[PDB]
Amino acid sequence: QLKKIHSSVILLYCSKDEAVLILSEARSLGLTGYDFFWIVPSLVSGNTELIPKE
Amino acid sequence: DYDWHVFSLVTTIFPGYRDFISFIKTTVDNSFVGWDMQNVITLDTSFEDAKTQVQLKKIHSSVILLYCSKDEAVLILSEARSLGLTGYDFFWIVPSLVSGNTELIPKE
C-alpha cells in the first residue's frame, strides 16, 4: 500500500502513537525528502511540549 | 526486431558491469534506429530501501536490461514485483549469467 505513493502532499489521520510508527515506516521507505510535505490535523500535534524525534 | 526502442539499464557492482555499460553506450551512439536510453542505474547499496527504492521508482519504461549474478537477481526481481514493475507489459531481458543451469529455476 505505502510503496505506491510518489506524490508531494500526504494528508494523515491517526492518533499520535500510531503517527510515530507510520512516520518511521515512511522514512524507512524514502518518503521524507525535500519534496514530500506532510499535513496532520490537531490530533497528532497535540501538546506542543512532547515532540518525538520521529 | 520487436520495436522496443525505449529502455533502461540496471546493473549492480558485479565485475564487468563497466564493460557492459561502455559497450552498450557505444553501440547506441552509432545506430540508425534512434534508441532512447532513459536511465543508467547502479544499485551499489545493500538494498537499504532508502536509495534503491527511489532508484527503482525512477524507472517507467517497458523494456529493462538487467546485469547481476543469479543470487542478486532474485532479490532485485522480488523488489520490482513488490513495487509493481512486473506485469503483462514490462519485458525483462537478462544475459546468460543469471539464467544459468536450466534445471534450477527459482520462484521469483
From Swiss-Prot, chain A:
Effect of mutating residue 16 to A/R: Nearly abolishes inhibition by Zn(2+)
Notes concerning its domains: Contains an N-terminal domain, a ligand-binding domain and a transmembrane domain. Agonist binding to the extracellular ligand-binding domains triggers channel gating. A hydrophobic region that gives rise to the prediction of a transmembrane span does not cross the membrane, but is part of a discontinuously helical region that dips into the membrane and is probably part of the pore and of the selectivity filter.
Recorded name of the encoding gene: Grin2a
Subunit details: Heterotetramer. Forms heterotetrameric channels composed of two GluN1/zeta subunits (GRIN1), and two identical GluN2/epsilon subunits (GRIN2A, GRIN2B, GRIN2C or GRIN2D) or GluN3 subunits (GRIN3A or GRIN3B) (in vitro). Can also form heterotetrameric channels that contain at least two GluN1 subunits and at least two different GluN2 subunits (or a combination of one GluN2 and one GluN3 subunits) (in vitro). In vivo, the subunit composition may depend on the expression levels of the different subunits. Found in a complex with GRIN1, GRIN3A and PPP2CB. Found in a complex with GRIN1 and GRIN3B.
Protein name, entry field: Glutamate receptor ionotropic, NMDA 2A
Positions bound to Zn(2+): 49
Subcellular location(s) per record: Cell projection, Dendritic spine; Cell membrane; Synapse; Postsynaptic cell membrane
Family from the record: Belongs to the glutamate-gated ion channel (TC 1.A.10.1) family. NR2A/GRIN2A subfamily.
Tissue expression as described in the entry: Detected in brain cortex, olfactory bulb, hippocampus including the dentate gyrus, striatum, thalamus, superior colliculus, inferior colliculus, midbrain and cerebellum (at protein level). Detected in brain cortex, hypothalamus and cerebellum.
Positions spanned in the full protein: 218 to 271 of 1464
Function text: Component of N-methyl-D-aspartate (NMDA) receptors (NMDARs) that function as heterotetrameric, ligand-gated cation channels with high calcium permeability and voltage-dependent block by Mg(2+). NMDARs participate in synaptic plasticity for learning and memory formation by contributing to the slow phase of excitatory postsynaptic current, long-term synaptic potentiation, and learning.
Top-level lineage group: Eukaryota
